[PDB]
Amino acid sequence: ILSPENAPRIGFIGFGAMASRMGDHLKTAGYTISAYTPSGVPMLPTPLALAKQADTVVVCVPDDEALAASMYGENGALAGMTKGSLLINTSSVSPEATATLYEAGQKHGVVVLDAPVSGSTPEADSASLVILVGGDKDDVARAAPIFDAIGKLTIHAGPTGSGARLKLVINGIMGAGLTTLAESVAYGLSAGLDRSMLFDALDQVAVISPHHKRKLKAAKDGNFAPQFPARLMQKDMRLLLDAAAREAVPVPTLAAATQQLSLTRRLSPNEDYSSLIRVMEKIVAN
Amino acid sequence: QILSPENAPRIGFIGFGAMASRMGDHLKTAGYTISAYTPSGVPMLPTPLALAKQADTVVVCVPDDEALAASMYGENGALAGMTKGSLLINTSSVSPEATATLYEAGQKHGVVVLDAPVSGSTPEADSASLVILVGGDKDDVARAAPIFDAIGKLTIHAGPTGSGARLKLVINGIMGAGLTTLAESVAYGLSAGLDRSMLFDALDQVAVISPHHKRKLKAAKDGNFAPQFPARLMQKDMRLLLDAAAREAVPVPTLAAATQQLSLTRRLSPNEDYSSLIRVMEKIVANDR
Amino acid sequence: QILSPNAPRIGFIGFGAMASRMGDHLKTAGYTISAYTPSGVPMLPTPLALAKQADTVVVCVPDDEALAASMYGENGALAGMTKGSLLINTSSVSPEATATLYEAGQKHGVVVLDAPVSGSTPEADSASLVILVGGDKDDVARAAPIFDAIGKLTIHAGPTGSGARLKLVINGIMGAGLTTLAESVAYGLSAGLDRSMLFDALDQVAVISPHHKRKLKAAKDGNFAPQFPARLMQKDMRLLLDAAAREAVPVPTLAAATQQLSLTRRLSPNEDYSSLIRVMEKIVAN
Amino acid sequence: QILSPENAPRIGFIGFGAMASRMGDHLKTAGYTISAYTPSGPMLPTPLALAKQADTVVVCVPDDEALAASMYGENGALAGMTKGSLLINTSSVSPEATATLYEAGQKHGVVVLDAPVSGSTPEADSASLVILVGGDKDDVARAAPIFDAIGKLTIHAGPTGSGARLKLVINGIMGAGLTTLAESVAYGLSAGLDRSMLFDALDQVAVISPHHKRKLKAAKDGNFAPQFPARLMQKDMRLLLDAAAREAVPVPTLAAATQQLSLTRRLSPNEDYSSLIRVMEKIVAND
């Protein structure tokens, strides 16, 4: 069991908004934290150097390409870990990248848990993330104190790859929930409804999620400070639509939502993905 | 002038299906005398005219524009039987064009027409948990307050005439596309090998699904699509929303995609709950043809 | 029975770009042309006055609301027509408006042919129109000399309402053909392809229709002179999607195309509907 | 320099399916010696063995993964190729795979032309392909006798990667043209229009491409013998949507078409991609 007694050193590959917040809760729980970032808590110069001085590695990188850049190659992290140790990938990446990393870990004798999370920076702050993990039950159990420190609930989704897939499911719901809301608000405004009336009325209905009601209140205030930036939301939508095409599942609502989030990312990659509400308001004003 | 049971005891319904009869029950408990007309035939009246002649206030609950026009207009319609100064409350989900036509027809009869569709289904109608979405003048909305208070938990004054109809269209789009989004996401998860019970239970625990749609997901886990809101009506409501969005020239690609999925849903089962798309997508992924 | 120049007088209800060009070809074929327009080459002050002095009436109005305005009432065209005459509606209207006019005609003893056309102002100019006609085969035969003068081919689509439905079919192919082309071009430009190269290359492939190749060449030139204005194309898509919803037929590609044509109309109602190509180039230029 | 039969007589194929074999027949007639490696197995046993025996390598594989399996590693085609030669990739793959192969080629001193084609098996039969090629103009000129034998027109689309991108553009037009047509036909049938009237009327309008009119005529008769199978069309749409998302370009019509082609693939992966017309007819008929 990867308690702070048995494995105190946790090294991060990637240390952005989400990862830095999980690190704080792991530091509080008794772990000693280190990190590597491509740009440059003690910092290590390469992924390999990071892995060579950690008991457990947590990966939090944006996409398949960043995962490959830090996992493999001359300075890659995987070859720096000891056999029997645990690699916990919390990144939102494709099923293909997940399978490649799992198999590379098996060759090196390292068990890779695909453990993406549901929740954004507010949930990371409060350690109320939901961990979505694929792997053998005994390997999930080894990581329990790490998952417990950063989250409020650990869902064992199935074997390797199951966490990645469950994350894609939840991302699609979140993305299309926002584009649905932005489009419906835009119709209402175009049809002459008072803006303050409309935003407040929608807070009162049962057909909007708590997450999206929070986004709607923020959008009433024009507040799109990044909790989950458009560039990352839109990437997650791209991953989901590629996976759904590989499985030959028709998903027209998700596909439409993806195109709306491409427009959102193009106009403002770094503000919150909910900025599409403002985008649609501007379309109907003009 | 307030439409309390004291001053306007007789509430006559045009249309009296699942939603309306539940509203009528609550208005009975609050002290009103309920009558109704239905095209198929609480005392019944044979025509909309006969209904309106013996009612103080008329409440309309019909499925679409065509049913509205058939019962409101003409020598035997409801408007011909109403008296100047009275109020007609339309709770139907109809187009902005139908709403404007009825408002102006009401004005020629001296009848104020409130467009007051509701948010909520049969469980909310049963518990008087409906949210009333009403367009009209502030003082006419005040006149109807005791009626709205008996059937719902909250009255949203959306603006002048037509505003309630428009707000209902907004909420319908959120509801319909929320379901198609959920059905498609579950379908991907199943196609990718996720265990069904795991997946359904996991989604009940996330913050990005509405309480309404979490209820639908739990029913779909059991294959239960007994109708609370049938596919044929949800799909009609999306048709109305997409027509209105086109008239306003607002691009709504997510809502448009959802509408087409609800056309498939209606074609395969018009009368089961609109959430049956979850089953439709499960069968596509299972290759259950 | 046949309406050869037997019935020399043809009166038009509506006399815009399309109608005026069929007028010239009918005048060339030896008919006597008269017209009414809501705005105001003999011009008649009311639809009634037009119908009273014409043998056959041809209707070309933009939408359902305009059709009812000029067809019905004591000043409408039907009130001026004599039992046994033919009304030929070439307007692009809903199946419901078509049925309403057919039944109203029956009450006056007037057969209404729903005969919308495939082709735009260039085809009206050359009499290359394809006539899409619903009605009884004998009534279609009566109107043959009229249809021959304005077009190259008469398709008997079926009974009343069939012409209107076939026009909806063809409108959807046109509209979504353009949005498909605009989006594909937009991808190519966003990925760095030279604009002049790309427009010229696409003229060389077999998967674009002759109509849309002509629009692509015009779009290379920024030429969106209004052969078919965005406001009318988008209305036609609205009618198609309403009808498809009433028939409960899932049409996701047509539904997506409609939303792109809503944006097109919002930005420029009066330019050619192909201006979406320019709209998408502007999105890519960002 | 120029890759005429005199200077470079041996053309080795990596992959040899419906289009590649038809390409090879035309290069045979032009005077080259054709050899081929296929994963199933004159055939050579490995891509390495194929490349060692050829003067020019032409690649025709279905996707990025097949391309990587056959180009890279000690048994791959690049390890058997000589500095100064040309690899011509006609495969419909991603911009990312194209860039990876170009850069790998550079390391071996091998110029990689990304030269996918517009046209299907009938056009490969008649050498009526349109070549869509990315690369330096001097390298395109080197390959001209090869392109001329298999096609009727070579479009130089720009530098490396430009051919792959132009192919994605054309794939989108083709895929969404078909889904548009299937949906419009479905509406017409649902609205009561006679089927033969409807198919015959659409053959006579100017808003359908010659390619899609050929598909429509075949669909009239229920004929979906594969010229371009649903599984490959749908893969091409997947690649286009991924690329459009990477470029952040909103393409809702193309995205909708892709979902319809996912259904088409699921129901029949191996029949012609135009079978969506039949799928939609069956939806409207309630089977």
Instruction: Report the 3 state secondary structure along D86-107.
Output: EEEECCCCCHHHHHHHHHHHHH
CB atoms within 10 A of CB D213: 17
Within a 13 Å sphere around the CA of A54, how many CA atoms are in the beta-carbon half?
A: 33
**Unique residue bearing structure tokens 């119709």:** A187
Q: How far apart are CA C237 and CA A129, in angstroms?
A: 45
Q: How far is CA D160 from CA B8, C9, C149, D139, D223, in A?
A: 80, 65, 54, 11, 39
Residue A247 lies in a domain: yes
Neighbors of chain D by Cβ distance (3+ pairs < 8 Å): A, B, C
Which residues, including other chains, have CB under 8 Å from residue D52's CB and lie 6 or more apart?
D80
Question: For residue B51, is it within any domain?
Answer: yes
Tokens of A231: 């560039």
Residues B136 and B257 in one domain: no
Asked whether residue B5 is assigned to any structural domain, the reply reads: no
Distance CA B206, CA B220 (A): 17
- Measured between beta carbons, which residues in chain C are less than 8 angstroms from residue D257? 180, 253
- Residue finishing a domain among B160, B184, B202: B160
Out of B28, B108, B168, B218, the active site residue is B168
Q: How many CA atoms lie within 13 A of C139 on its CB side?
A: 20
Distance CA B128, CA B124 (A): 6
Paired with A4 in beta bridges are none
The answer to whether residues D153 and D123 belong to one domain is yes
Place of tokens 């135009």: D274
Whole-number Å distance between alpha carbons of C112 and C109: 10
Element (H, E) at A66: helix A64-71
D61 is in an annotated binding site: yes
DSSP code for D77: S
Q: Which of D252, D263, D286 sits opposite B253 (nearest CB)?
A: D252
CA distance B105 to B185: 46
- Å from C269 to nearest chain B CA? 10
Q: DSSP secondary structure string, D260-275?
A: HHHHHHHH-SSSBGGG
Q: Check whether residue B219 and residue B98 sit in a common domain.
A: no
Q: What angle (nearest 5°) sits at the alpha carbon of residue D238, between those of residues D234 and D243?
A: 145
Non-local CB neighbours of A40 within 8 Å, separated by 6+ positions:
none
Residues 235-264 of D with CB under 8 A from B: 252, 256, 263
Using DSSP bridges, classify how beta strands C151-158 and B112-115 pair: parallel, antiparallel or unpaired: unpaired
* D227 is annotated as contributing to ligand binding: yes
C-alpha distances in Å from residue D86, one per residue of D7, D51, D135, D158 = 12, 11, 11, 17
End-to-end CA distance of chain D: 60
Taking CA atoms, A38 is separated from A12, A50, A64, D8, D100, in Å, by 12, 12, 15, 46, 22
Annotated binding residue at D92?
Answer: yes
* Same domain as D275, residue D219: yes
Residue entry with tokens 């409408």: C76
Cα dist from A249 to A160, B209, D89, whole Å: 21, 21, 30
Residue with tokens 């309106």: B52
CATH number at residue D53: 3.40.50.720
Tell me how far apart the alpha carbons of residues A132 and A155 are, in angstroms, rounded to a whole number. 5
How far is CA B9 from its chain centroid? 25
CA D195/CA A119 separation, integer angstroms: 52
Counting the structural domains of chain C, the total is: 2
3-state secondary structure of D209: coil
Distances (CA, A) of B14 to B79, B103, B145, D134: 11, 16, 20, 69
Find chain A residues with C-beta within 8 A of C252's C-beta.
Answer: 252
Nearest CA in chain B to C248: B263
Task: Identify whether D5 is part of a domain.
Answer: no
- Give a yes or no: residue B1 inside a domain: no
Greatest CA separation found in chain C?
A: 64
Strand-strand pairing, D86-89 and D111-114? parallel
Contacts of A172 (CB under 8 A, 6+ apart): A237, A240, A251, A254, A257, B181, B184, B185, B188
Q: Is B186 a member of any domain?
A: yes
Interface of A with B in 143-162 (CB under 8 A): 153, 155-158, 161-162
* A83 CB burial (10 A radius; 0-12, 13-18, 19+): exposed
* Neighbour tally for C106: CB within 10 Å: 12
Return the closest-CA partner of residue C231 out of B247, A176, B73: B247
A70 known member of a binding site: yes
Interchain contact, A256 vs B260, CB within 8 Å: no
Contact flag D250-A260 (C-beta cutoff 8 Å): yes
Chain B residue numbers touching D286 (CB-CB < 8 A): 267
Residue B281: both structure tokens together? 């997508």
Residue to substitute from A72, A231, A247, A262, interface D, most D β-carbons within 10 A: A262
Total count of residues recorded for chain A? 286
Rounded Cα gap, residues A62 and A56, in angstroms:
20
Q: Which residues pair with D89 in a beta bridge?
A: D59, D114
Q: Tell me if D242 and A242 make a contact (CB, 8 A cut-off).
A: yes
Question: A154 and A49 in one domain?
Answer: yes
Structure tokens belonging to residue D74: 């000690």
Q: Any known ligand binding at D126?
A: no
**D32 and D93 assigned to the same domain:** yes
Whether the Cβ atoms of residue A115 and residue A143 lie closer than 8 Å to each other:
yes
The type of residue at B62 is V
B258 CB-near residues (< 8 Å, 6+ apart): A180, A253, B173, B176, B177, B179, B180, B181, B238
- Is C43 a known ligand-binding residue? no
The C-alpha atoms of residue D107 and residue C260 are separated, in whole angstroms, by: 45
Tell if the CB–CB gap between A266 and C256 is shorter than 8 Å: no
| Burial track A158-169 (b if 16+ CB lie within 10 A, e otherwise) | bebbbbbbbbbb
Determine the residue type at C113. Answer: L
Strand partners, C112: C87
Token pair for residue B276?
Answer: 């049956």
Count of C-beta atoms within a 10 Å radius of residue A79: 17
Q: DSSP for chain C?
A: --------EEEEE--SHHHHHHHHHHHHTTPEEEEE-S----B-SSHHHHHHT-SEEEE--SSHHHHHHHHSSTTSSGGG--TT-EEEE-----HHHHHHHHHHHHHTT-EEEE--EE--HHHHHHT-EEEEEES-HHHHHHTHHHHHHHEEEEEEEESTTHHHHHHHHHHHHHHHHHHHHHHHHHHHHHTT--HHHHHHHHTT-TTS-HHHHHHHHHHHTT----SSBHHHHHHHHHHHHHHHHHTT---HHHHHHHHHHHHHHHH-SSSBGGGHHHHHHHHHH-
Q: Of the residues A159, A176, A206, which one is the last residue of a structural domain?
A: A159
Element of type H or E holding D168: helix D162-190
Calculate the CA D275 to chain-centre distance: 18
Round to whole Å and give the CA distance between A217 and A203: 8
Residue B3 lies in a domain: no
When CB atoms are compared, the residue of B245, B253, B264 closest to C256 is B253
> Can you tell me which residue has the tokens 């594909």?
C184
- Domain stop point among A125, A159, A193: A159
Local structure of B68: helix, strand or coil:
helix
8 Å CB contact of A263 and C283: yes
Burial string for D229-253 (b: 16+ CB within 10 Å, else e) reads bbbbbbbbbbbbbbbbbbbbbbbbb
Query: Phi/psi at A60 (nearest 5 deg)?
Result: -145, 85
Alpha carbon distance D68, D54 (integer Å): 19
For helices C252-267 and C162-190, the axis angle rounded to 10 degrees is: 70
Contacts made by residues C82-86, CB under 8 angstroms, sequence distance 24+? C82/C109, C83/C108, C83/C109, C83/C110, C84/C109, C84/C110, C85/C55, C85/C56, C85/C57, C85/C110, C86/C3, C86/C56, C86/C57, C86/C110, C86/C111, C86/C112, C86/C113, C86/C139, C86/C142, C86/C143
* Pairing outcome for strands A9-13 and A32-36: parallel
Check whether A128 is labelled as a binding-site residue: no
Q: Judge contact between A182 and A174, C-beta under 8 A.
A: no
Mutation target to probe the C interface, by most C beta carbons within 10 A, among D162, D205, D261 is D205
Q: Give the nearest chain B residue to C234 (CA atoms).
A: B246
Q: B264 contacts in D (CB within 8 Å)?
A: 283
Choose among C145, C77, C157: nearest CA to C118: C157
> Domain of B208?
167-286
C250, C260, C269: residue with CB nearest B260: C250
Q: How far apart are CA D287 and CA D283, in angstroms?
A: 6
Cα distance from D266 to chain A (closest Cα, Å)? 6
Q: Give the closest of C165, C184, C280 to D169, CB-based.
A: C184
Distance CA C159, CA A128 (A): 65
> How near does any CA of chain D get to the CA of A235, in Å?
8
In Å, how far are B7, C248, D11 from B146, measured between CA atoms?
11, 40, 87
Could you tell me whether strands A117-118 and A129-134 are parallel, antiparallel, or unpaired per DSSP bridges? Answer: antiparallel
**CB pair distance less than 8 Å for D263 and B284:** yes
Yes or no, beta carbons of D249 and C157 under 8 Å apart:
no
Check CB contact under 8 Å for A245 and D251: no
Q: Which two tokens stand for residue B56?
A: 């103080």
From the list A245, A250, A263, which residue is nearest D250 (CB)? A263
Tokens standing for D269? 């992966």
d(CA D158, CA C196): 11
In this structure, the answer to whether residues C39 and C115 fall within a common structural domain is yes
Chains in contact with B, counting 3 or more C-beta pairs less than 8 Å apart as contact? A, C, D
Rounded Cα gap, residues A54 and D68, in angstroms? 34
Q: How far is C100 from chain B (nearest CA, A)?
A: 14
Q: Which residues of D participate in catalysis according to the annotation?
A: 167
Interface test with B, best of D253, D258, D266, D278 (most B CBs within 10 A): D266
Q: Return the SS3 of B90.
A: strand
CA A175 to chain centre: 13
Pair D109, D175 in one domain: no
Question: Bridge-partner residues for B57, per DSSP?
Answer: B11
Whether A137 has a binding-site annotation, put simply, is no
- The closest of B223, B66, A267, D88 to C286, measured between CA atoms, is A267
> Which helix or strand (DSSP H or E) is residue A166 part of?
helix A162-190
Cβ atoms of C118 and C173 closer than 8 Å: no
Q: Which candidate from A248, A259, A269 shows the least CB-CB separation from D251?
A: A259
Say which residue the tokens 């029956």 belong to. C106
Closest CA to A219 of A257, A179, A173: A179
- The catalytically annotated residue of C167, C213, C220, C282 is C167
State the Cα–Cα distance between residues A194 and A283, nearest whole angstrom.
16
C25 and C44 share a domain? yes
All residues at 6 or more sequence positions from C248 whose CB lies less than 8 Å from its CB, including other chains: B235, B263, B264, B266, B267, B270, D190
Task: Give B249's contacts in chain C (Cβ within 8 Å).
Answer: 234, 262-263, 265-266, 269
Distance CA(B115)–CA(B107), nearest Å, equals 13
What DSSP state is assigned to residue B44? B
Question: How far is Cα A189 from Cα A184, in angstroms, rounded to an integer?
Answer: 9
Shortest Cα distance, chain C CAs vs residue B258, angstroms: 9
Same domain, C154 and C31: yes
Distance of alpha carbon B146 from alpha carbon B140, whole angstroms: 12
All residues of chain B having their beta carbon less than 8 Å from the beta carbon of residue C176 are none
| B207, B254, B260: residue with CB nearest A180 | B254
Place of tokens 């909310």: B124
Instruction: Provide the pairing of β-strand C32-36 with C56-59.
Output: unpaired
Q: Are B152 and B64 in a shared domain?
A: yes
> Which residue of chain D is at minimal alpha-carbon distance from B260?
D256
Q: Which residues of A are catalytic?
A: 167
How big is the A-D interface in CB pairs under 8 Å? 75
Interface of C with D in 56-75 (CB under 8 A): none
SS (H, E, C) C216-285: HHHHHCCCCCCCCEHHHHHHHHHHHHHHHHHCCCCCHHHHHHHHHHHHHHHHCCCCEHHHHHHHHHHHHH
Are A155 and A86 part of one and the same domain?
Answer: yes
DSSP assignment letter at B253: H
B194 touches chain C (CB under 8 A): no
- DSSP reduced 3-state for A32: strand
Kind and range of the H or E run holding A50: helix A47-52
Tell me how far apart the terminal alpha carbons of chain A are, to the nearest angstrom: 59
For B154-158, the CB contacts below 8 A with 24+ separation are: B154/A204, B155/B131, B156/A197, B156/A201, B156/A204, B156/B131, B156/B132, B158/A193, B158/A197, B158/A201, B158/B133, B158/B134
The partner residue sitting opposite D153, judged by closest CB among C130, C186, C204, is C204
**Domain holding C231: CATH number?**
1.10.1040.10
**Which tokens sit at A204?**
């009162």
* Backbone torsions φ then ψ of B110, nearest 5 degrees: 70, 25
Strands C9-13 and B130-135: unpaired
Judge whether C17 is annotated as a binding position: yes
Contact D243, A241 (CB under 8 A): no
In a domain, A2, yes or no: no
